[PDB]
RNA sequence: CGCUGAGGACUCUACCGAGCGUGAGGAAGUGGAUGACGUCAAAUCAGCACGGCCCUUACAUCCGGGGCGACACACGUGUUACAAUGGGAGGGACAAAGGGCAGCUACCGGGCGACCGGAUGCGAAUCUCUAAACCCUUCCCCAGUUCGGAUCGGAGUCUGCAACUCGACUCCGUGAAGCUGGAUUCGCUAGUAAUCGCGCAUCAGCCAUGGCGCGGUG
RNA sequence: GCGAGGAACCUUACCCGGGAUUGAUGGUGAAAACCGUAGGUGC
């Protein structure tokens, strides 16, 4: 009768204080980091016609999971 | 801009909405049916535009508006989690 | 020849077949596996009974030679004479498989 | 962020209902945004704000063309402090539109 | 315009006679570069 | 940098002479070209020598001594690029039916001492010696 | 007993199991004469144990993934060179005579914006 | 081309006002947009003026026509 | 399988090159981002705003069919080739990043194939999409060829209401110019050039040989 | 191989015509639509 806990979230320590804060709040396994999914978005500078000059923007995903044997806004959880 | 375009859209989305005897005819083979529907209904007449602006290019499915825009919001930081590389 | 071809002598099947009207690679090797004659084998070393069924594998099926020449040229005149796009853009010279022009022939 | 929710994949809608005084999901001095705001409405209403900053250790404001209602445009620099939060602000003239952008670094 | 010559010489100028004033800019630099 | 022993003979000019063949990165390639080369060589050349020893006394021969800047020494180094460069060049240009096949026609004539690579060395003597007072 | 070591070679990684024995080399459950078929990679692979003269003495597990036949035998020589190492330390002279301890760090560069390649550029004309 | 298990692609009101035509036992012109219709052998013997974008250029269709796009016997472009 | 339990791999925390030079001992900087003040009345009123001016029986607005894809030609940027360091046939081996809900599809059955029909798992470190250059054996033996694959003919498969103008892919057939290219001209300096394949954005489908990334050989 | 990082219809601004304002079943029709039961991608 154990519980998974997935926690997501785009700010790593807003990840890590969650997972802590869910912790502390009698026998659950230590947090454990998936790996992060990384995206990066190539834009034009320019509102008109220059190619070359380009600037790149990134959005990470944080997971962590918990076994339970036995919230700040930005943070999905899939408690089941 | 050319809020025309964007009431053509909105008139489009709409009529592909009122769909379910598209599905129907499409499961079966009835063709000559499917030609009996008006053309905005089809799907395909659908196009993707900037959600403020309207610019029908340069579109980004995952946040629903253009490379402009986008590169604004997200150096004004209003996109949550997007952030310069 | 072989139905009124003179093959190269000293090529193998596979690629010596070819060398009629009406036969790529591929018909090559289809024709040789049905009448089962081995492709690696050259055409000089033919048996007659192999140069038979060959022949007679090219008959029945496999329209070649003079006949496809003259079955391409009534396609081409009766596409021509209909007056379609494709007839005038073969009778003016152009492209006509939607390639675009101003930039190549 | 000035927008805290998750969204992953799904940013689309939300992000389209975010977006549809001395204002700045689950010490106007100091400001740079009401600063902007007050410089534009007075600019509306026909930048030495630096001084008013200046313990604020650096401040710039830079204004942009169609100046005092002339026909070119001119950009000026106004800064002070020592100056190594940014906002901008636009004021609709009887001649166009003036950009004003505020740097204050405390 | 501008001449191909190998290494490029381009001139400008803005008048109601711009291919005479242009040609002799041109003729000022071909005899700097001839020597 | 870093050059590896050739695997069979354990050489470093082997291997030079091997990246000077190479096209596109095959390695392999240019490797099984002079591995091979070096087999009709022997066999054609069959001397009291080796197959090594012969084509190392090749690219002795057709190395050049001075280059004109006025005539000048040359350092070892680029005089062996420019040995390994001249005899790959001619050997290209030459005909042959394969790419050992000429390679190994070149390094024999170089070896007995008449051939492209050795006329082009003899040219470049002469230009040298041509301006002999300014030096 | 067991030995244990890691190479690393670009995208390459070897993890080395070594013994005492005499001269089975087996590559991912497989011998190494059928998983390196050259013998310029197998001559790469047992590079340091000829140098030392440790060869016909060990027996080697390795288990290499990612990268391609050089970078995996670039990375299985670091890493029978680290546990010939460990092994002895007084081959560590020896070893970095020739350079099979170092790790070389060169990866494959990012491609940069505006460009066909990392470093090439467009024809500007 | 067309897949064969949807069959051929046919104007309906097209193909109506043909038939229609062929009960009568009337000649006349049968004006349409429909280039991309289809040539059936019920459309033998009429005429069909076809629309290229600014007029309507007549086609008398016979047999070799049959299996043959309406558009492909009224050009669009003029060039001279 | 029970387990691994930290040898890798994941994330998150602490670190590590210290010099007139050399030097030993030790694993031993590069790429990107950020551009003070000046210049081009440089580019964008068609991303978005915005002063002025000009349109209301029309420069506003809905629809169908055309066009943006035409070709006497010129210029620019690329992709294939002109072959032996190569082209076919058969077999063996090695990646990383990234994507996936009407989507990727295990596994069966049909078709030469593009694909189709049942069925399974997976909103996914769990289930799926991912190699080629390379190696071995063999043929072609210097030819406009077993090089090249443009053009054209036929038959199909998908998407979509619809593939004529004007789509992608598949299977037959046909098989052109091209024998390494003058004056001139461009890029790069190490995991770089060169070469090989893989993935993504937009996207019903796709003219994707473009753009943005990844690894292999080097 | 620049805005364009997806022009068959849509996109689409351009052209030719068919309409409409000045902001439930039938018949006809290519559709829009018809008949009965402010805005401007204009300067
Ligand atoms: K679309």
């Known amino acids: 009768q154990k519980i998974r806990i997935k926690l997501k979230s785009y700010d790593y320590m807003l990840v890590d204080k969650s997972a ?36 790149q923007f990134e959005l990470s995903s944080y997971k962590r999971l918990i076994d339970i044997y036995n919230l700040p806004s930005g943070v999905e959880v899939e408690i089941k | 801009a050319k809020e025309s375009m964007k009431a053509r859209e909105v008139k489009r989305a709409k009529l592909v909405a009122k769909a379910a005897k598209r599905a129907a005819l499409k499961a079966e083979g009835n063709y000559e049916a499917l030609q009996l529907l008006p053309k905005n209904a089809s799907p395909v007449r659908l196009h993707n535009r900037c959600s403020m602006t309207g610019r029908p290019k340069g579109y980004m499915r995952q946040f629903g508006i253009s490379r402009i825009q986008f590169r604004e919001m997200a150096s004004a930081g209003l996109i949550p989690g997007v952030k310069k590389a | 020849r072989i139905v009124g071809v003179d093959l190269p002598q000293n090529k193998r099947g596979f690629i010596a077949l070819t060398y009629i009207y009406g036969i790529g690679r591929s018909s090559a090797i289809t024709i040789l596996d049905k009448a089962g004659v081995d492709r690696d084998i050259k055409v000089k070393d033919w048996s007659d009974d192999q140069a038979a069924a060959i022949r007679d594998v090219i008959g029945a099926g496999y329209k070649v030679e003079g006949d496809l020449r003259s079955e391409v040229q009534l396609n081409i005149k009766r596409l021509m004479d209909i007056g379609c796009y494709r007839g005038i853009r073969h009778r003016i010279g152009l492209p006509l498989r939607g390639q675009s022009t101003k930039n190549n022939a | 962020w000035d927008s805290n929710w998750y969204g992953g994949r799904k940013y689309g809608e939300t992000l389209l209902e975010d977006s549809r005084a001395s204002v700045s999901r689950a010490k106007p001095e100091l400001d740079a945004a009401i600063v902007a705001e007050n410089i534009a409405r007075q600019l509306e209403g ?22 005092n209602g002339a026909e070119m445009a001119r950009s000026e620099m106004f800064k002070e402090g020592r100056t190594p939060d940014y906002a901008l602000a636009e004021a609709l003239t009887k001649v166009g539109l003036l950009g004003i952008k505020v740097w204050i670094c405390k | 315009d501008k001449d191909v010559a190998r290494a490029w010489l381009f001139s400008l100028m803005e008048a109601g006679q711009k291919s005479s004033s242009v040609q002799r800019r041109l003729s000022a630099l071909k005899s700097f570069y001839k020597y | 940098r870093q050059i590896l ?95 050992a096949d000429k390679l190994a026609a070149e390094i024999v004539d170089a070896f007995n001492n008449q051939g492209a690579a050795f006329k082009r060395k003899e040219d470049m003597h002469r230009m040298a010696e041509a301006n002999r007072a300014f030096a | ?120 550029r467009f024809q500007f004309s | ?74 050009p669009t472009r003029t060039f001279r």
Do not use: C
């Open chain 1, 20 to 55: 802590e804060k869910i912790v502390k709040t009698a026998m659950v396994s230590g947090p454990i980091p998936l790996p992060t999914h990384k995206r990066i978005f190539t834009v034009n500078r320019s509102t008109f016609v220059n190619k070359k000059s380009r600037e």
């Open chain 6, 5 to 99: 022993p050739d695997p069979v003979y354990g050489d470093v000019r082997v291997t030079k002479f091997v990246n000077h063949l190479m096209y596109d990165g095959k390695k392999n390639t240019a490797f099984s070209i002079f591995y091979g080369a070096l087999d009709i060589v022997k066999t054609k050349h069959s001397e009291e020598k080796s197959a090594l020893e012969i084509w190392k006394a090749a690219l002795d021969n057709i190395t050049p001594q001075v280059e004109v800047k006025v005539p000048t020494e040359i350092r070892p180094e680029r005089k062996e690029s420019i040995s390994m460069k001249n005899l790959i060049l001619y050997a290209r240009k030459r005909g042959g039916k394969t790419m």
């Open chain 7, 1 to 120: 007993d067991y030995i244990n070591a890691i190479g690393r070679r670009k995208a390459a990684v070897a993890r080395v199991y070594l013994s005492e024995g005499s001269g089975k080399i087996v590559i991912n459950k497989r011998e190494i004469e059928q998983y390196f078929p050259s013998s310029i990679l197998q001559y790469i692979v047992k590079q340091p144990l000829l140098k030392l003269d440790v060869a016909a003495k060990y027996d080697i597990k390795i288990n290499l993934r990612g990268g391609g036949f050089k970078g995996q035998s670039e990375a299985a020589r670091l890493a029978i060179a680290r546990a010939l190492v460990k092994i002895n330390p007084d081959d560590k002279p020896a070893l970095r005579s020739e350079g099979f301890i170092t790790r070389d760090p060169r990866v494959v560069e990012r491609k940069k914006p505006g460009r066909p390649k990392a470093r090439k």
């Open chain 8, 1 to 74: 081309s067309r897949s064969l298990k949807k069959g051929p692609y046919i104007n309906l009101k097209l193909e109506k006002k043909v038939l229609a035509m062929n009960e009568s036992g009337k000649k006349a012109v049968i004006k349409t947009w429909a280039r991309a219709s289809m040539i059936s052998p019920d459309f033998v013997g009429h005429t069909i003026a076809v629309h290229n974008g600014n007029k309507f250029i007549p086609v008398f269709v016979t047999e070799n026509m049959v299996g043959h796009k309406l558009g492909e016997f009224s």
């Open chain 4, 46 to 67: 026909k930048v030495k704000a630096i001084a008013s900053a200046m313990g604020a250790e650096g401040i710039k404001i830079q204004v942009s063309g169609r100046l």
